[PDB]
Symmetry: D2
Subunit: 264 residues, 4 copies
């Protein structure tokens, strides 16, 4: 009785999160800090935001650094991971989060748009996993980021993006087998509509007559997707990531968790 | 509010005198919940789980109820709420395993399995919905045999759990009117007396090996080269029934260490 | 000139083939050359119309009354089928009932009404099919796009009754391989039948506020092909699965809903 | 109209000089389609397929196009329509396999696989949609490794095909504006040079055994105790691309004989 159980702590662990200056990655980075991890905050374009995330993690009593790395470029992924281990001594947790959204009828999709989406969402994530396996401590954690659009929800004009995430679901199942030789688990989270810069950029494409409504209105209509009648927020996703990368999440391995509040 | 804790909440777990249910009950108590430990046949083991939850500093009571009988399910939930004043979390765990070729399955055997595994769980969820506080949690128990793994001579049991996977998806819609989340956990091979009872039927030529050899060979199913244990399942249930698990709703989480 | 997918010299049994999807399946298998056992429990005149259409097409059929909630009636149905045609190659488990209600309102009686036919009934139709079929035969079971693909409010009991079927067919394919029998399910979307008309109000948002005909027209927009599902759509897939050419689809649930959203 | 026939239709199959593509091409011709036989490397095999289809009484032409190159996909579809006047059915079949632990996968190997299996298939679907008559058919080619079977060291290929499963579901929505259905076939182990190239990677100590011995062992994956053959896949494609297949739309059909 002299012990109150504190579940899911990451004290003594080092995490890296791709694209953690903003949106879901930021909330993952802060949540892992809150749980006791030291955090490598990665950005490509948003150093102002990355600084605020670093400051937020230091403020709640952990440590953090920001490292610029364009995760479309494999040489920059190698450097990101090399710099992470040089700075903190080790790496236990890698969360592949960076991504871009796209909308377009099949007939209008160009080579350039296909390559813009796959280079980050699919190829970038793959090589983030590759470098994570190669740098992680035994018993570590790899997380990849999919979407409820890969399998559960079928949105018109969303083929390119949906396919970029469907690849991820397949990678994590096989990666769990390969990464077993270091006792590293590999899982994905597949968020539903989560209120971020990305959400506001494209919510008109998910709502039936979306272009005809205001952003605030589209957010309210998205809140009725869930039988809980609220939006998904970045912290909702971060909480699941925190469970999977904890010691206690070990027996969830090679799985894609859909985190959408039960959306219809 | 410590993240992941259940302080001030009340939980009920069917079949928590032993196996996975016992691990779930102790874990929810460890997280700060008061626990109703249901048993049908194992009163002594149930009291030991109660005494363990009290020793780690929470409260618990054992209530006898055969969850094949819907009137006993109603009475179990009525007595839970009467004792602790409220219920926030209901975990439907009780189940039985069965093996046999389609051609050999009797009406008696179909009824034995579906009455507990499927009908029983359905009416546990029904009484949970009716008794639970707003913002509460329902967990049902499936199996990685429902969808992920196709074992010969396992059709009755696999189908009994496949029904659960469908129930949770729709239950999340119905139960949203009380902001209750509904999920299932689908364990893989988890070391309990159920596991040891049928490990021969899951290992190729399993009758040919010893019980310890069957457990070692199951260990290699996971890329992590260990068996699943009741605690592994309990930890996932604990997360789902916490405030922090709210955005997992209407899902089946397969908890098998990445088994092949 | 190659004629694919024929069933000449084969014998098929379809449960609940007097009306709706079952009737379309029975007529389709007859058109492809199978002799057909038309099962009914309550609709003898409907069943005789189906037998008459199959004979008109150039095949042979009989109607056999059997309530497939009752395992003894299932045993008799299969014994009578083999006694009459000499053999059985194809068993299609189709009989079902729909149900709607919030979890909180579902009674023991309604749970038992639905599972006894939809789940237990189908299970024992498969059992007696395995025991009576020729080597190299076919079992088809009927699921629903509501088991996994769509999640409809107040539809838990029915959706679960069909999710059990999906698990059964996967494991049945293993057990039934020792007679080279393949086992699959079809999972229809909204298919225009008596059942469809009975419950379309519960699938369409504020369905009670529209006519049965209006509800049908609204369901036609679920598919990107902008038409309803019909019994024939489902019969066509069952016909491919029970053909020689369908052999390499085994242990699968095929969702047949025209791509519905 | 004869049930299941394609009289008066024109089909195009990528990679139809050999393997599964060749069986698809001959099967669509046997059913009454005129067939465009695409190859990139196998002109003499493509001509043998063309001569087979002419011999059974249909018409065919072989067209060289590397479907890694989107401008060559455009030209393939342009030349198909210019030759037969129309296109009704497009089967995206070309693919390559890859094995390697995640730690060993290069940029060059990722691009080799995704450029053909994922990007190439996507742009074949794009050009099919732009060239097809209303009421047409697109088929893409996945694998049972994308979802059903998790083979070690198979991540790059499995992911290449997992993208396909997502493409077909959304393509079915976009292509509905021309009443074109879009489906994938996901073969299991199917006896071709691809099968033989990696059957050692799907068997423990596989590198020991002979190729014929590995094929005999694979035949026991199915409860039907035979291998899958290209014809097994071609018959499913023939059904999906027929008038009678219309109500299967946006789906991935796993065609593996019930493999475990
Ligand atoms: N929001 C949703 O509803 C939703 C739903 C399902 C899935 N997702 C997925 O969840 C993940 C995050 O989404 P979000 O909503 O947070 O997106 P967001 O708000 O758009 O943020 C995108 C993040 O990705 C980073 N990023 C972009 N390009 C990068 C590059 N080349 N290299 C490294 N990092 C890069 C950005 O960093 P910089 O600003 O520094 O470039 C930014 O941190 C994505 O993978 C997305 O596909 C989101
Ligand atoms: N172990 C595995 O590998 C595995 C894998 C997948 C799924 N599961 C599932 O996980 C759940 C628990 O399995 P387990 O391994 O812990 O099995 P177990 O050790 O056999 O325990 C069975 C539990 O069910 C209870 N129970 C049995 N009949 C009951 C009744 N009529 N009313 C109320 N409770 C009843 C038992 O209580 P009494 O002794 O008091 O009867 C006992 O607590 C089951 O639903 C099982 O199907 C287990
Ligand atoms: N229509 C849809 O949208 C849809 C969608 C998905 C799945 N399904 C499923 O497809 C199957 C056929 O549905 P439907 O639309 O054709 O339904 P229906 O129009 O309601 O016809 C029901 C059939 O089931 C027979 N039946 C009922 N009780 C029976 C019993 N005790 N024993 C034997 N047969 C019995 C009926 O024969 P009697 O009249 O002789 O009793 C009748 O032929 C069902 O399993 C249904 O769940 C339908
Ligand atoms: N067990 C299996 O066989 C199996 C299982 C699951 C899925 N699959 C899939 O089924 C499909 C066919 O496989 P298969 O077994 O028949 O393989 P295969 O025997 O190796 O045949 C490969 C085919 O792809 C064509 N191809 C290769 N590169 C090409 C390019 N750049 N442009 C156009 N075409 C090209 C080849 O033509 P050229 O010789 O002219 O280059 C050949 O026709 C593939 O998508 C594969 O992933 C196969
Ligand atoms: C109801 C709804 C509204 C949205 O704005 C999104 C989504 C859902 C959604 O599922 C989604 C998934 C995704 O991978 C990226 C997104 O930007 C999204 C969204 O933006
Ligand atoms: C490799 C292995 C060995 C086993 O004994 C089991 C399993 C797997 C398994 O998946 C399983 C599922 C289940 O629902 C009940 C069980 O008793 C089990 C098992 O017993
Ligand atoms: C849009 C829509 C309208 C309907 O009437 C049904 C359905 C869908 C549907 O999916 C369905 C499934 C089923 O198993 C039985 C039904 O009666 C149905 C339906 O009746
Ligand atoms: C039992 C078995 C043996 C094999 O050789 C293969 C497979 C299965 C298999 O599934 C497979 C899938 C695939 O997409 C490509 C392949 O070359 C294959 C295979 O080669």
């Amino acid at each position: 009785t002299q012990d109150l159980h504190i579940p899911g702590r990451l004290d003594g662990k080092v995490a890296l999160v791709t694209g953690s200056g903003r949106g879901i990655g930021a909330a993952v980075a802060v949540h892992l800090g809150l749980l006791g991890a030291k955090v490598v905050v990665n950005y490509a374009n948003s150093p102002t935001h990355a600084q605020k995330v670093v400051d937020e993690i230091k403020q709640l009593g952990s440590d953090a650094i920001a490292i610029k790395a364009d995760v479309r470029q494999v040489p920059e992924i190698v450097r990101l991971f090399d710099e992470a281990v040089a700075h903190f001594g080790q790496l236990d947790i890698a969360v592949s989060n960076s991504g871009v959204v796209s909308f377009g009828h099949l007939k209008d999709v160009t080579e350039e748009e296909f390559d813009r989406v796959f280079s980050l969402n699919t190829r970038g994530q793959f090589f983030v996993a590759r470098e994570a396996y190669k740098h992680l401590n035994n018993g570590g954690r790899i997380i990849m980021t999919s979407s409820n659009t890969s399998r559960d929800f079928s949105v018109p004009k969303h083929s390119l993006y949906s396919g970029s995430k469907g690849a991820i679901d397949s990678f994590v199942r096989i990666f769990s087998k390969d990464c077993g030789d270091k006792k590293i688990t590999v899982n994905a989270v597949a968020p539903g509509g989560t209120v971020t810069d990305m959400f506001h950029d494209v919510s008109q494409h998910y709502i039936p007559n979306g272009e005809t409504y205001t952003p605030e209105e589209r957010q309210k209509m998205a809140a009725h997707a869930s039988p809980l009648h609220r939006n998904g927020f970045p912290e909702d996703i971060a909480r699941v990531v925190g469970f999977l990368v904890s010691a206690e999440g070990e027996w969830i391995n090679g799985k894609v968790l859909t985190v959408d509040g039960g959306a219809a």
